[PDB]
Design an enzyme around this catalytic site. Structure first.
Site, short mmCIF file in Angstrom:
data_model
loop_
_atom_site.label_atom_id
_atom_site.label_comp_id
_atom_site.label_asym_id
_atom_site.label_seq_id
_atom_site.Cartn_x
_atom_site.Cartn_y
_atom_site.Cartn_z
N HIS A 1 0.80 -1.22 0.00
CA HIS A 1 0.00 0.00 0.00
C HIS A 1 0.84 1.28 0.00
O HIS A 1 0.32 2.38 -0.22
CB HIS A 1 -1.02 0.03 1.16
CG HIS A 1 -0.44 -0.21 2.52
ND1 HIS A 1 -0.52 -1.43 3.16
CD2 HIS A 1 0.13 0.64 3.41
CE1 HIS A 1 -0.03 -1.32 4.39
NE2 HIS A 1 0.37 -0.07 4.56
N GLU B 1 -2.80 13.67 2.03
CA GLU B 1 -3.98 13.20 2.74
C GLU B 1 -4.58 14.42 3.41
O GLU B 1 -5.77 14.71 3.25
CB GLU B 1 -3.60 12.12 3.75
CG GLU B 1 -2.94 10.92 3.09
CD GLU B 1 -3.04 9.65 3.91
OE1 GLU B 1 -2.51 9.60 5.04
OE2 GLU B 1 -3.67 8.69 3.41
N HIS C 1 6.90 6.87 5.58
CA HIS C 1 6.38 6.48 4.29
C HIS C 1 5.70 7.66 3.63
O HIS C 1 5.56 8.72 4.24
CB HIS C 1 5.30 5.39 4.44
CG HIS C 1 4.21 5.87 5.35
ND1 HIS C 1 4.33 5.78 6.72
CD2 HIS C 1 2.99 6.40 5.11
CE1 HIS C 1 3.23 6.23 7.28
NE2 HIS C 1 2.40 6.61 6.32
N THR D 1 -4.18 6.63 9.06
CA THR D 1 -5.03 6.88 7.91
C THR D 1 -5.24 5.64 7.07
O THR D 1 -5.82 5.70 5.99
CB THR D 1 -4.47 8.01 7.03
OG1 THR D 1 -3.23 7.59 6.45
CG2 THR D 1 -4.27 9.28 7.86
N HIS E 1 4.93 10.84 6.02
CA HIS E 1 4.56 10.55 7.40
C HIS E 1 5.71 9.89 8.17
O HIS E 1 6.17 8.80 7.80
CB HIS E 1 3.33 9.63 7.44
CG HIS E 1 2.06 10.30 7.02
ND1 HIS E 1 0.96 9.60 6.58
CD2 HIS E 1 1.72 11.61 6.99
CE1 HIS E 1 -0.01 10.45 6.28
NE2 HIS E 1 0.42 11.68 6.53
N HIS F 1 2.49 9.19 0.71
CA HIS F 1 1.16 9.10 0.11
C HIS F 1 1.23 9.98 -1.11
O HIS F 1 1.56 11.17 -1.00
CB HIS F 1 0.10 9.67 1.03
CG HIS F 1 -0.03 8.87 2.31
ND1 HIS F 1 -0.52 7.58 2.32
CD2 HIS F 1 0.26 9.17 3.60
CE1 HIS F 1 -0.52 7.12 3.55
NE2 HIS F 1 -0.06 8.06 4.35
#
Ligand SMILES: [Zn+2]
EC number: 4.2.1.1
Length: 258
Positions: free
Chosen positions: A62, A104, A92, A196, A117, A94
């Site tokens: 993911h 996010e 990591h 999240t 993050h 997003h």
């Protein structure tokens, strides 16, 4: 059929397997800069990453995590709205399929190309697994990425993505200094929220930095070359692995600056 970001297993379906998805302190949220309260009682953040020890980089299906040795207080976060010491365990990102989306959290509805993050856990709880079961268990530093000039300190990460293209792949990743990912200023917004991604536990104290860092189109393009799938399965590009803004539900966002 487990969770993901596709049309059939995306964020809108998560509540079926994880009811807390419709909870009272879910993240991310939109940060309304004119409604956020300046709180002069907030201390400055204290980031001690000088003794950080990165260990490997992994594609978990993911996103990709860079993991650190958290068996001692080597890379820690203190101060700000935090009580106690929080150890860095992994970081990591997003990101989106286009430069206009990917973050996010949003600022006055503005979306950034990506969001970093840096996950830390409260040492009083002994280990990450126990910390996630507590309301003050985690502290996540959120940093926005906008497309512009290249970020030298991120190239080491970009260069190894080729070796962890598919789900399950991992590679040694030592001597990476996370200080090269920080912006000049540490001014921030903070509010109580959650992870999240499933299990979406409400154990996070979010610290979102005001100043974004810049990365080049070429660097973000390599993020988009990763796969959600495992080796030998049909190719699904790893893009848009972000959860949309959730209701603030009478929570208050505080700012360390005015
Ligand atoms: Zn995250």
């Amino acid at each position: 059929h487990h969770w993901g970001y596709g049309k059939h297993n995306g964020p809108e379906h998560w509540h079926k397997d994880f009811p807390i998805a419709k909870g009272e302190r879910q993240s991310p949220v939109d940060i309304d800069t004119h409604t956020a309260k300046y709180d002069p009682s907030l201390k400055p953040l204290s980031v001690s990453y000088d003794q950080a020890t990165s260990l490997r980089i992994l594609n978990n299906g993911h996103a990709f995590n860079v993991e650190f040795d958290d068996s001692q207080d080597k890379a820690v976060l203190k101060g700000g709205p935090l009580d106690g010491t929080y150890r860095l365990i992994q970081f990591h990102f997003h990101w989106g399929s286009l430069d206009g989306q990917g973050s996010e959290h949003t600022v006055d509805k503005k979306k950034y190309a990506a969001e970093l993050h840096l996950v830390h856990w409260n040492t009083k709880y002994g280990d990450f697994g126990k910390a996630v079961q507590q309301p003050d268990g985690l502290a996540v530093l959120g940093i926005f990425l906008k497309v512009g000039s290249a970020k030298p300190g991120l190239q080491k990460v970009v260069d190894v993505l080729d070796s962890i293209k598919t789900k399950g792949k991992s590679a040694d990743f030592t001597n990476f200094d996370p200080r090269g990912l920080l912006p000049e200023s540490l001014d921030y917004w903070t509010y109580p929220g959650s992870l999240t991604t499933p299990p979406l536990l409400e154990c996070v104290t979010w610290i979102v930095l005001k100043e974004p860092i810049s990365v080049s189109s070429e660097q973000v393009l390599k993020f988009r070359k990763l796969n959600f799938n495992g080796e030998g399965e049909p190719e699904e590009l790893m893009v848009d692995n972000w959860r949309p803004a959730q209701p603030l539900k009478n929570r208050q966002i505080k700012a360390s600056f005015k």
